[PDB]
């Protein structure tokens, strides 16, 4: 029996947030910092919950040192060496509280990560990523990492439904990475037919996490600050971004109209440059992106957009955005000429 | 609890007006003038209820002097000086009954407006505009302007839902400006995720105004005369337009294929040229538009379109259009080659 | 009260015809000729019910002489003179049974038509066209033409709903022309907001005609032979076409890549060349179309397509197509690369 | 009575497959081979159920010799001669178990096929194709072929609904070819208005076959490996492909940016090169396609995609994919820049 779910699954383009009444005079009143206490690691975090994705070109140390100035976060890419990290530590000690070390489920990866966590005790976040986030093999791996590092906060993914968000949390992960399909350079939908609309995946997964006192990252699929806001509005605790951060000076890669090469974690460009075949669910794209320059401007644009959103729905802090969010269903997002 | 309204919100593209039986021989029979009596100012107005928007390039004095010849209206941009206005008065006294002076919620703006209303008693309309039309701060500001000018008619905005249309009317505004998102150079949807489909916003807001014996302007989102007609058909008492009036000789700005620069009230181009950051809900676009020449032709095209609409639905006067309007839901608006 | 009909109105793109079981070996078995007896004129017609539209460039005498060889029909454009027609009669007497003379509702038009019907008794069809097919003025005009020519068959239009199809038939018209909006060079939707999806307009109007033993033409909106088939399948008794016949050698106008100018009946190009302002509901477009050459090939393509349709649904004659038509609702019509 | 089925018929773009929990470590665990026993021929087949379509350019002997190395299948085009086939047999004896000989319903075709089956007893599949797969003439032809070759497995088509799938199976065909409209170079929808969405046609037809212990091919409409997976997920026993195999070295036709000419079975290019008028339901297109080079890479890409799909839904073998398939309804398939 092949069956078809009756419920149309919407994405970001299919909706808008409705404005509401409030006493908020203007957007600089709004506080975008959140304070979280994690279910399993028992650690506490405070910052602006926007994470740079652990992709080759954007999850760099340079990107980190800027984000951190804004209390934002960076999931560092897994190809840096131990020596690379010990220089990062020496150079930017104040940044270590705002980064996560990354690993796949392979033994070599686990060992290298371990050497990093031991050499840099200030790093207190771990980001774990596989091709099939629904595998029992990932479940037992998450148990292993939890046992090895009982006081480190664990981000794990990726999934799109709530049964697997609960199983991953109950198996020791703190923050589940929700998203398969929508990523700017993800090709699961084309290559495999498998995936989920981003908005629907957050609505559905956020509820499942929060009943366990766990948390989620909306990973992928945001194309402008409005999407970030919708992602938060849908219940996401953090939002992670690759494509919106691609193209800047603090991105790794030469400038080539000035452009830069933006490529997926499991892309052909990636496999050539490195053992990444089964790191993500699809062999992602390799695109050319216009050179945007310094990431500060982009950060300002994004945070500013999000402050307005909160103001316009009556949220004085980011914590209250999902509480105040009413989405309306629309037939369009743009007025063309 | 993030929730999603079950009702799909349609816009202008999603519908058509149905023709109906009548005794109307032709479109020159139709009278497009309306006579209004305002709830709070208690003043009476007669004209063709189509308003040029208070944008830098289109809300000019030159635009005004043409519109006025057609009994149309112009919301003048807020950057003109007192001296500029006193020349407008001297030069085009017969036009003063067909313009509104504009202001934001800042004290400097209020003072400059006040000096203008005192120096030109013939100006009897006020247009008030903010970034967050749902703020309690806007509500109290509207009370202040009402108290300062008890015999001036007040347009205030912008909103998209009826609870705020009622609160603004009950707080002293006469005519509520309805529209957030659809404007040709508005970027709220992209930058903030917040907005509303224009047609749905008028249907919903018109009902709310009219129960209080108040009035609304459909502000933004019309791309052709058909949209104007639909806007009126949905219940709007006036319709305001920026983009359809952009590009003409009576527009402010040099001619540059001949083009002209059309930019938003809170756009980057605006901030550079002037203190406009929080005048509108978004930092609007700056587009190039083809030089259309004299606004008379455009006016003729638009009024002509609207006369046909009334004829085809059986409305001998514009007053009867919403009464006679049945919208049908469609899957398209164009026959491509 | 502005209201919105709950029923989504589909067009040709939104549907497909379902194949069905039959004993039909192949498409040359299918007979596309119909025999009609008209309600009010009491005349009988036999032919392939596909009519060339009465547009300047396609409703020519040259087009007629080809169509007629295929038992197809031509609604001749209203600008030809009496002398022009008397040469047509002399030259192509066998074609006169397959054409209609055209007129608007003006007295000059009526007189010129009258002179034509008197000078050419073999012409037994009249085509009457106005801007507002819902006007009481059109209703009384139809009564007048019926009384003046009691044995001529009258095509009248255009409408999209059944209440007006019945009133026009009961007022003496034989064949109602159904379609407002979808025409290739019609601009009602853009200029006035008024119109109707073609498929929905035929479904709805065909039922209304046939209960009175009257007939309809699906006028406008077909872009390929599939649309013709759907139009017939929806219940239409005839289908009229402009754009699909545009571009051929037998079209009026010079060749200019080789192109030809195709323009609407009430278009600016039309008004310049001639008193046509209120002949159709909109001031239609003027497009450039590629030179297709001889209309024979196009005719062959269209008739062939329609024979296959009948075969694939089990209709041995065109009469049985609507009887055998089941439409399925689809989300697309094309497989792009 | 023209009527409209209430059920919207979805295609591949309208859905995604949902990931599910499993114990599958990775995609090389998945077995894509199936073992089938046919209802009427009583023969058994084992291989990867992906068939190259019997089109001029892709159903070649060269294509066959590669496919066969991958346990894939090739429906050979019907224009090869007896002598051509006897060389194929001599050269690639091990491939004969993985090809089908093709024929239309004409006597010449039947005779030539017969001479081939007699000269090459190793060929045990027959592929039969007509313009109207719903004709009683096709039904009796299928009876004739069954009687002539009682131990050959018969693929017959094409249809889209289950009443005709059952009648063709009960009349002796083994494997019904399901698909009319979606094919990359099919024009039925444009030329005739007749067709069916591919996904809906498989869902509906698969059920009908399987109740008779028969089988179906999803013929046409796949544009990437995701579509293949969805096709299998919907219940299809095999999937046939033309366009995805077009463009390779083992395709027939010269290289011309390097391109190759890809044309339909009943296309104008086909009729010119050969008696094919009524072989398929439409006169298909002739497109230019980029030269992809060797078909091995494409095969690897497609099989790899399909292994991931099975892994991500928890299917260790292709047999279990439809059993494990839950489709979700979506509003999009792509993230544009
Ligand atoms: N399946 C797949 N996902 C990728 C690949 N590269 C990056 N991603 C995903 O894309 C996400 C970011 O999405 P974006 O913000 O660019 O839309 C990353 O966090 C990661 O989840 C890849 O090669 N394959
Ligand atoms: N949010 C926003 N709205 C603008 C800006 N500039 C103009 N608008 C809106 O656009 C309206 C006109 O819309 P239009 O007729 O061009 O679609 C104006 O009345 C105003 O409400 C801007 O910079 N930001
Ligand atoms: N409203 C309007 N309709 C036109 C005009 N010119 C042609 N048409 C319509 O277009 C029809 C043919 O549509 P087509 O087959 O090109 O889609 C004609 O029969 C007529 O009803 C025009 O200028 N204005
Ligand atoms: N109606 C029609 N179908 C064709 C023609 N040529 C190929 N096809 C269909 O297209 C199918 C392959 O579809 P594709 O994989 O290219 O989308 C073939 O198996 C066949 O069923 C043609 O000329 N007319
Ligand atoms: Na491991
Ligand atoms: Na980059
Ligand atoms: Na103030
Ligand atoms: Na302008
Ligand atoms: Na008259
Ligand atoms: Na023409
Ligand atoms: Na035969
Ligand atoms: Na090819």
Short mmCIF file of N, CA, C and O in Angstrom, two decimals, chain C residues 133-216:
data_model
loop_
_atom_site.label_atom_id
_atom_site.label_comp_id
_atom_site.label_asym_id
_atom_site.label_seq_id
_atom_site.Cartn_x
_atom_site.Cartn_y
_atom_site.Cartn_z
N UNK C 133 -22.50 42.78 -23.92
CA UNK C 133 -23.44 41.80 -24.42
C UNK C 133 -24.53 41.56 -23.40
O UNK C 133 -25.49 40.86 -23.68
N UNK C 134 -24.36 42.17 -22.24
CA UNK C 134 -25.34 42.13 -21.18
C UNK C 134 -26.28 43.35 -21.17
O UNK C 134 -27.16 43.42 -20.34
N UNK C 135 -26.12 44.32 -22.09
CA UNK C 135 -26.96 45.52 -22.11
C UNK C 135 -28.37 45.26 -22.64
O UNK C 135 -28.53 44.51 -23.65
N UNK C 136 -29.37 45.94 -22.06
CA UNK C 136 -30.76 45.88 -22.57
C UNK C 136 -30.84 46.45 -23.99
O UNK C 136 -31.66 46.03 -24.80
N UNK C 137 -29.94 47.37 -24.29
CA UNK C 137 -29.80 47.90 -25.63
C UNK C 137 -29.43 46.85 -26.64
O UNK C 137 -29.91 46.89 -27.76
N UNK C 138 -28.55 45.92 -26.28
CA UNK C 138 -28.26 44.79 -27.17
C UNK C 138 -29.43 43.87 -27.32
O UNK C 138 -29.69 43.40 -28.39
N UNK C 139 -30.17 43.64 -26.24
CA UNK C 139 -31.34 42.79 -26.25
C UNK C 139 -32.36 43.31 -27.31
O UNK C 139 -32.79 42.54 -28.18
N UNK C 140 -32.69 44.61 -27.28
CA UNK C 140 -33.67 45.20 -28.22
C UNK C 140 -33.14 45.26 -29.63
O UNK C 140 -33.90 45.14 -30.60
N UNK C 141 -31.84 45.45 -29.77
CA UNK C 141 -31.23 45.37 -31.10
C UNK C 141 -31.35 43.97 -31.72
O UNK C 141 -31.65 43.81 -32.92
N UNK C 142 -31.10 42.96 -30.92
CA UNK C 142 -31.29 41.59 -31.37
C UNK C 142 -32.75 41.38 -31.80
O UNK C 142 -33.00 40.77 -32.81
N UNK C 143 -33.72 41.91 -31.08
CA UNK C 143 -35.11 41.81 -31.51
C UNK C 143 -35.38 42.43 -32.90
O UNK C 143 -36.16 41.91 -33.72
N UNK C 144 -34.72 43.55 -33.13
CA UNK C 144 -34.85 44.31 -34.37
C UNK C 144 -34.28 43.54 -35.56
O UNK C 144 -34.88 43.49 -36.64
N UNK C 145 -33.11 42.97 -35.36
CA UNK C 145 -32.47 42.22 -36.45
C UNK C 145 -33.28 40.96 -36.75
O UNK C 145 -33.48 40.59 -37.91
N UNK C 146 -33.78 40.32 -35.71
CA UNK C 146 -34.61 39.13 -35.89
C UNK C 146 -35.84 39.45 -36.73
O UNK C 146 -36.21 38.66 -37.64
N UNK C 147 -36.49 40.58 -36.41
CA UNK C 147 -37.70 41.01 -37.11
C UNK C 147 -37.37 41.41 -38.55
O UNK C 147 -38.06 41.02 -39.48
N UNK C 148 -36.28 42.13 -38.76
CA UNK C 148 -35.89 42.47 -40.12
C UNK C 148 -35.54 41.26 -40.98
O UNK C 148 -35.81 41.24 -42.19
N UNK C 149 -34.91 40.24 -40.40
CA UNK C 149 -34.44 39.06 -41.17
C UNK C 149 -34.92 37.77 -40.51
O UNK C 149 -34.16 37.08 -39.82
N UNK C 150 -36.21 37.45 -40.66
CA UNK C 150 -36.76 36.28 -39.93
C UNK C 150 -36.27 34.90 -40.36
O UNK C 150 -36.51 33.92 -39.63
N UNK C 151 -35.63 34.81 -41.53
CA UNK C 151 -35.11 33.53 -42.04
C UNK C 151 -33.57 33.46 -42.10
O UNK C 151 -32.99 32.50 -42.62
N UNK C 152 -32.91 34.47 -41.52
CA UNK C 152 -31.46 34.44 -41.33
C UNK C 152 -31.07 33.95 -39.94
O UNK C 152 -31.66 34.33 -38.97
N UNK C 153 -30.07 33.10 -39.87
CA UNK C 153 -29.52 32.63 -38.62
C UNK C 153 -28.60 33.68 -37.95
O UNK C 153 -27.66 34.17 -38.57
N UNK C 154 -28.88 34.00 -36.69
CA UNK C 154 -28.19 35.09 -35.96
C UNK C 154 -27.20 34.58 -34.90
O UNK C 154 -27.59 33.90 -33.94
N UNK C 155 -25.91 34.86 -35.10
CA UNK C 155 -24.93 34.72 -34.01
C UNK C 155 -24.80 36.08 -33.30
O UNK C 155 -24.61 37.10 -33.98
N UNK C 156 -24.91 36.08 -31.96
CA UNK C 156 -24.82 37.32 -31.15
C UNK C 156 -23.87 37.20 -29.94
O UNK C 156 -23.90 36.20 -29.23
N UNK C 157 -23.06 38.21 -29.67
CA UNK C 157 -22.32 38.17 -28.42
C UNK C 157 -21.60 39.40 -27.98
O UNK C 157 -21.72 40.44 -28.61
N UNK C 158 -20.82 39.32 -26.90
CA UNK C 158 -20.44 38.11 -26.20
C UNK C 158 -20.87 38.10 -24.77
O UNK C 158 -20.86 39.15 -24.14
N UNK C 159 -21.18 36.92 -24.25
CA UNK C 159 -21.50 36.73 -22.82
C UNK C 159 -20.70 35.55 -22.19
O UNK C 159 -19.90 34.91 -22.89
N UNK C 160 -20.87 35.31 -20.88
CA UNK C 160 -20.17 34.19 -20.21
C UNK C 160 -21.02 33.45 -19.19
O UNK C 160 -20.55 32.51 -18.54
N UNK C 161 -22.24 33.90 -19.00
CA UNK C 161 -23.11 33.31 -18.04
C UNK C 161 -24.41 33.00 -18.72
O UNK C 161 -24.72 33.57 -19.76
N UNK C 162 -25.15 32.07 -18.12
CA UNK C 162 -26.29 31.46 -18.74
C UNK C 162 -27.54 32.29 -18.72
O UNK C 162 -28.37 32.13 -19.60
N UNK C 163 -27.74 33.14 -17.71
CA UNK C 163 -28.93 34.03 -17.67
C UNK C 163 -28.98 34.92 -18.92
O UNK C 163 -30.04 35.23 -19.43
N UNK C 164 -27.83 35.29 -19.45
CA UNK C 164 -27.81 36.20 -20.62
C UNK C 164 -27.85 35.46 -21.95
O UNK C 164 -28.29 35.99 -22.99
N UNK C 165 -27.31 34.23 -21.94
CA UNK C 165 -27.48 33.29 -23.05
C UNK C 165 -28.97 33.06 -23.20
O UNK C 165 -29.41 33.23 -24.28
N UNK C 166 -29.76 32.73 -22.14
CA UNK C 166 -31.17 32.56 -22.32
C UNK C 166 -31.90 33.79 -22.79
O UNK C 166 -32.87 33.70 -23.53
N UNK C 167 -31.52 34.97 -22.32
CA UNK C 167 -32.25 36.17 -22.66
C UNK C 167 -31.96 36.48 -24.11
O UNK C 167 -32.83 36.92 -24.79
N UNK C 168 -30.73 36.29 -24.57
CA UNK C 168 -30.43 36.57 -25.96
C UNK C 168 -31.14 35.59 -26.94
O UNK C 168 -31.67 35.96 -27.98
N UNK C 169 -31.21 34.33 -26.57
CA UNK C 169 -31.93 33.36 -27.37
C UNK C 169 -33.39 33.67 -27.39
O UNK C 169 -34.01 33.69 -28.44
N UNK C 170 -33.97 33.96 -26.24
CA UNK C 170 -35.40 34.23 -26.21
C UNK C 170 -35.74 35.54 -26.92
O UNK C 170 -36.90 35.80 -27.22
N UNK C 171 -34.75 36.38 -27.15
CA UNK C 171 -34.95 37.64 -27.81
C UNK C 171 -34.72 37.49 -29.32
O UNK C 171 -34.84 38.48 -30.06
N UNK C 172 -34.40 36.27 -29.78
CA UNK C 172 -34.28 35.96 -31.23
C UNK C 172 -32.92 35.52 -31.82
O UNK C 172 -32.81 35.18 -33.01
N UNK C 173 -31.86 35.54 -31.04
CA UNK C 173 -30.56 35.11 -31.56
C UNK C 173 -30.54 33.61 -31.65
O UNK C 173 -31.24 32.95 -30.90
N UNK C 174 -29.78 33.04 -32.58
CA UNK C 174 -29.76 31.55 -32.69
C UNK C 174 -28.60 30.93 -31.91
O UNK C 174 -28.76 29.96 -31.18
N UNK C 175 -27.44 31.53 -32.10
CA UNK C 175 -26.19 31.00 -31.66
C UNK C 175 -25.55 32.08 -30.80
O UNK C 175 -25.30 33.20 -31.29
N UNK C 176 -25.36 31.80 -29.52
CA UNK C 176 -24.68 32.78 -28.67
C UNK C 176 -23.18 32.64 -28.61
O UNK C 176 -22.66 31.54 -28.32
N UNK C 177 -22.49 33.78 -28.74
CA UNK C 177 -21.03 33.78 -28.72
C UNK C 177 -20.58 33.96 -27.26
O UNK C 177 -20.83 34.98 -26.63
N UNK C 178 -19.96 32.90 -26.72
CA UNK C 178 -19.58 32.81 -25.35
C UNK C 178 -18.08 33.00 -25.21
O UNK C 178 -17.31 32.20 -25.73
N UNK C 179 -17.68 34.10 -24.54
CA UNK C 179 -16.29 34.31 -24.18
C UNK C 179 -15.98 35.77 -23.98
O UNK C 179 -16.20 36.54 -24.88
N UNK C 180 -15.48 36.11 -22.77
CA UNK C 180 -14.98 37.44 -22.42
C UNK C 180 -13.80 37.34 -21.45
O UNK C 180 -13.96 36.87 -20.30
N UNK C 181 -12.61 37.75 -21.95
CA UNK C 181 -11.35 37.69 -21.22
C UNK C 181 -10.27 36.91 -21.98
O UNK C 181 -9.18 37.45 -22.26
N UNK C 182 -10.52 35.61 -22.25
CA UNK C 182 -9.45 34.70 -22.72
C UNK C 182 -8.89 34.91 -24.09
O UNK C 182 -7.83 34.33 -24.42
N UNK C 183 -9.56 35.70 -24.91
CA UNK C 183 -9.13 35.90 -26.28
C UNK C 183 -7.69 36.27 -26.35
O UNK C 183 -7.24 37.12 -25.56
N UNK C 184 -6.96 35.71 -27.31
CA UNK C 184 -5.54 36.06 -27.49
C UNK C 184 -5.17 37.54 -27.45
O UNK C 184 -4.11 37.88 -26.93
N UNK C 185 -5.97 38.44 -28.03
CA UNK C 185 -5.65 39.88 -28.00
C UNK C 185 -6.66 40.74 -27.20
O UNK C 185 -6.59 41.96 -27.20
N UNK C 186 -7.54 40.07 -26.46
CA UNK C 186 -8.47 40.72 -25.55
C UNK C 186 -7.70 41.18 -24.33
O UNK C 186 -6.83 40.45 -23.84
N UNK C 187 -8.02 42.37 -23.83
CA UNK C 187 -7.44 42.89 -22.62
C UNK C 187 -8.50 43.22 -21.55
O UNK C 187 -8.24 44.08 -20.72
N UNK C 188 -9.66 42.56 -21.51
CA UNK C 188 -10.65 42.99 -20.47
C UNK C 188 -10.14 42.79 -19.07
O UNK C 188 -10.38 43.61 -18.19
N UNK C 189 -9.46 41.67 -18.85
CA UNK C 189 -9.01 41.32 -17.50
C UNK C 189 -8.03 42.35 -16.93
O UNK C 189 -8.12 42.71 -15.76
N UNK C 190 -7.13 42.84 -17.78
CA UNK C 190 -6.15 43.84 -17.42
C UNK C 190 -6.74 45.26 -17.34
O UNK C 190 -6.42 46.06 -16.42
N UNK C 191 -7.57 45.60 -18.31
CA UNK C 191 -8.13 46.93 -18.37
C UNK C 191 -9.36 47.15 -17.51
O UNK C 191 -9.64 48.31 -17.14
N UNK C 192 -10.11 46.09 -17.19
CA UNK C 192 -11.37 46.27 -16.47
C UNK C 192 -11.56 45.34 -15.27
O UNK C 192 -12.40 45.60 -14.43
N UNK C 193 -10.82 44.24 -15.21
CA UNK C 193 -10.98 43.29 -14.13
C UNK C 193 -12.11 42.32 -14.34
O UNK C 193 -12.36 41.46 -13.49
N UNK C 194 -12.79 42.44 -15.48
CA UNK C 194 -13.99 41.67 -15.76
C UNK C 194 -13.67 40.57 -16.77
O UNK C 194 -12.94 40.77 -17.78
N UNK C 195 -14.24 39.40 -16.54
CA UNK C 195 -14.03 38.30 -17.45
C UNK C 195 -14.46 37.00 -16.85
O UNK C 195 -15.10 36.99 -15.78
N UNK C 196 -14.08 35.92 -17.52
CA UNK C 196 -14.47 34.52 -17.11
C UNK C 196 -13.54 33.51 -17.78
O UNK C 196 -13.13 33.71 -18.99
N UNK C 197 -13.16 32.46 -17.04
CA UNK C 197 -12.39 31.36 -17.66
C UNK C 197 -13.17 30.68 -18.80
O UNK C 197 -14.37 30.42 -18.67
N UNK C 198 -12.51 30.43 -19.92
CA UNK C 198 -13.22 29.89 -21.08
C UNK C 198 -13.92 28.56 -20.82
O UNK C 198 -15.06 28.42 -21.15
N UNK C 199 -13.25 27.59 -20.22
CA UNK C 199 -13.86 26.29 -20.05
C UNK C 199 -15.12 26.38 -19.20
O UNK C 199 -16.14 25.76 -19.49
N UNK C 200 -14.99 27.07 -18.08
CA UNK C 200 -16.13 27.26 -17.18
C UNK C 200 -17.30 28.01 -17.88
O UNK C 200 -18.48 27.71 -17.66
N UNK C 201 -16.97 28.98 -18.73
CA UNK C 201 -18.01 29.76 -19.41
C UNK C 201 -18.80 28.85 -20.40
O UNK C 201 -20.01 28.87 -20.40
N UNK C 202 -18.12 28.03 -21.21
CA UNK C 202 -18.81 27.00 -22.06
C UNK C 202 -19.62 25.95 -21.27
O UNK C 202 -20.77 25.71 -21.59
N UNK C 203 -19.05 25.33 -20.26
CA UNK C 203 -19.79 24.35 -19.47
C UNK C 203 -21.10 25.02 -19.10
O UNK C 203 -22.17 24.57 -19.45
N UNK C 204 -20.99 26.16 -18.44
CA UNK C 204 -22.16 26.84 -17.87
C UNK C 204 -23.18 27.36 -18.92
O UNK C 204 -24.38 27.22 -18.78
N UNK C 205 -22.67 27.93 -20.00
CA UNK C 205 -23.54 28.47 -21.06
C UNK C 205 -24.16 27.42 -22.00
O UNK C 205 -25.33 27.56 -22.44
N UNK C 206 -23.39 26.38 -22.33
CA UNK C 206 -23.87 25.29 -23.18
C UNK C 206 -25.14 24.75 -22.53
O UNK C 206 -26.17 24.63 -23.18
N UNK C 207 -25.14 24.50 -21.24
CA UNK C 207 -26.36 23.89 -20.64
C UNK C 207 -27.56 24.79 -20.83
O UNK C 207 -28.69 24.32 -21.01
N UNK C 208 -27.31 26.09 -20.76
CA UNK C 208 -28.39 27.06 -20.74
C UNK C 208 -29.04 27.20 -22.15
O UNK C 208 -30.27 27.26 -22.29
N UNK C 209 -28.18 27.22 -23.17
CA UNK C 209 -28.62 27.22 -24.56
C UNK C 209 -29.43 25.99 -24.89
O UNK C 209 -30.51 26.06 -25.47
N UNK C 210 -28.92 24.83 -24.50
CA UNK C 210 -29.45 23.60 -25.02
C UNK C 210 -30.81 23.30 -24.45
O UNK C 210 -31.66 22.64 -25.08
N UNK C 211 -31.08 23.83 -23.26
CA UNK C 211 -32.43 23.68 -22.69
C UNK C 211 -33.50 24.44 -23.48
O UNK C 211 -34.70 24.16 -23.37
N UNK C 212 -33.04 25.40 -24.29
CA UNK C 212 -33.94 26.20 -25.14
C UNK C 212 -33.88 25.73 -26.59
O UNK C 212 -34.51 26.32 -27.48
N UNK C 213 -33.12 24.67 -26.83
CA UNK C 213 -32.92 24.15 -28.17
C UNK C 213 -32.13 25.21 -28.99
O UNK C 213 -32.18 25.26 -30.24
N UNK C 214 -31.33 25.98 -28.27
CA UNK C 214 -30.37 26.91 -28.91
C UNK C 214 -28.94 26.38 -28.96
O UNK C 214 -28.68 25.27 -28.57
N UNK C 215 -28.02 27.20 -29.42
CA UNK C 215 -26.64 26.76 -29.67
C UNK C 215 -25.62 27.83 -29.19
O UNK C 215 -25.99 29.01 -29.07
N UNK C 216 -24.36 27.43 -28.90
CA UNK C 216 -23.27 28.40 -28.58
C UNK C 216 -22.02 28.19 -29.41
O UNK C 216 -21.80 27.07 -29.86
#
